Amino acid sequence: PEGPEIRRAADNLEAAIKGKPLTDVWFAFPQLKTYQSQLIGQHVTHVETRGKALLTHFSNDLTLYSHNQLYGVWRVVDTGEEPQTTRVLRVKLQTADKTILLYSASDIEMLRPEQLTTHPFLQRVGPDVLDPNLTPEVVKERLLSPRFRNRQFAGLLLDQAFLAGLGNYLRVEILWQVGLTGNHKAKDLNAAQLDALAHALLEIPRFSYATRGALFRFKVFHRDGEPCERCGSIIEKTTLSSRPFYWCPGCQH
DNA sequence: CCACCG
DNA sequence: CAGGAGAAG
Ligand SMILES: [Zn+2]
């Protein structure tokens, strides 16, 4: 689950419980139990996302930080319901009609307002690809900036200090869209390619967010052994940056 | 380069 | 049941 999927989840958490008084609050972790009574009768004011970090803001200036990594997932249920699952329950935020449940995530903590800028992940993250205020022109500047112009794309497009919310499927899909392998740096692109990359870094995540739940589809991710829809070569699966990697040898260079 | 499910 | 599927030491 990458930025698009986390923002879709956050939207569903807001539809379920934004603004509604909490009738019960439960945390599995011993260090979070102290906040249960403190949050009963408060409400979620909004669910913010910064890339894959999810920030559940409450009406008393606390914010729950959660990060699902590769395995966490939120579920929305009617209050009192809890469908059988083998997953470990980590957070329950309950209101009169709907409850939200966080399963499996291990990175969960309660933040005071000052920590929204000093928490180690929140301090390092770059601009979010789903932020409508972030433009292709600003992404082009970021690519060409001294800080990032010499970085290889293979790792750059996984690094949340560059653009928050990109993960491996988005890396693979963006590089195929612009015809590039991961072994390039922004300093070496021509202006047309840089512009194409800047646009794709925003437009593919935004299209996935809008339509994965003309609709988003994978062009190469998990399509090894299939013909590329652009040039017909057979898509390959390898590893890149210690993660799987999908690409087309006929049209990515 | 710690942390559910062929 | 070792190893595959976001991020930091
Ligand atoms: Zn191709």
Angle at A236 between CA A219 and CA A166, to 5 degrees: 50
CATH of the domain at A33: 3.20.190.10
CA A111–ligand 1 middle distance (angstroms)? 46
- Count CA atoms closer than 13 A to A197's CA, side-chain side: 29
Distance CA A253, CA A237 (A): 15
Query: For residue A120, which nucleotide's C1' is closest to its Cα?
Result: C8
Distance CA A223, CA A53 (A): 28
Resolved by: X-ray
How many domains, chain A? 2
C1’ C8 / CA A123, Å: 14
Is the CB of A193 less than 7 A from some atom of nucleic acid strand B? no
Residue pair A182/A154 in contact (Cβ under 8 Å)? The answer is: yes
Q: What are phi and psi of A71, to 5 degrees?
A: -135, -15
Resolution number, Å? 1.2
C1’ C2 / CA A84, Å: 27
Question: In DSSP terms, which residues pair with A109 in a beta bridge?
Answer: A65
> DSSP for chain A?
--HHHHHHHHHHHHHHHBTPPPSEEEESSGGGTHHHHHHTT--EEEEEEETTEEEEEETTS-EEEEE-TTT-EEEEEETT-----SSPEEEEEE-SSEEEEEES--EEEEE-TTHHHHSHHHHH---BTT-TT--HHHHHHHHHSTTTTTS-HHHHTT-TTTSBT--HHHHHHHHHHTT--SS--GGGS-HHHHHHHHHHHHHHHHHHHHH-------SSTT-TTSBPTTT-PBPEEEEETTEEEEE-TTT--
Binding site per annotation, positions of A for DNA: 69, 124, 168
Residues with a beta carbon under 5 angstroms from ion ligand 1: A 228, 230-231, 233, 248, 250-251
Looking at A105, A126, A147, the residue that finishes a domain is A126
Shared domain for A92 and A152, answered yes or no, is no
Pairing of strands A44-50, A63-67: unpaired
Residue-wise burial string across A198-209, b where 16 or more C-beta atoms lie within 10 A, e elsewhere: bbbbbebbbbbb
Sheet of A63-67, strands arranged across: A44-50, A53-58, A63-67, A107-111
Domain hosting residue A89, numbered range: 1-126
Shared domain for A18 and A140, answered yes or no, is no
C1’ C5 / CA A216, Å: 21
Looking at A108, A126, A144, the residue that finishes a domain is A126
Looking at A92, A126, A160, the residue that finishes a domain is A126
Shared domain for A140 and A183, answered yes or no, is yes
Shared domain for A92 and A144, answered yes or no, is no
- Count CA atoms closer than 13 A to A31's CA, side-chain side: 7
A195 token code pair: 């512009």
Shared domain for A119 and A4, answered yes or no, is yes
Shared domain for A120 and A188, answered yes or no, is no
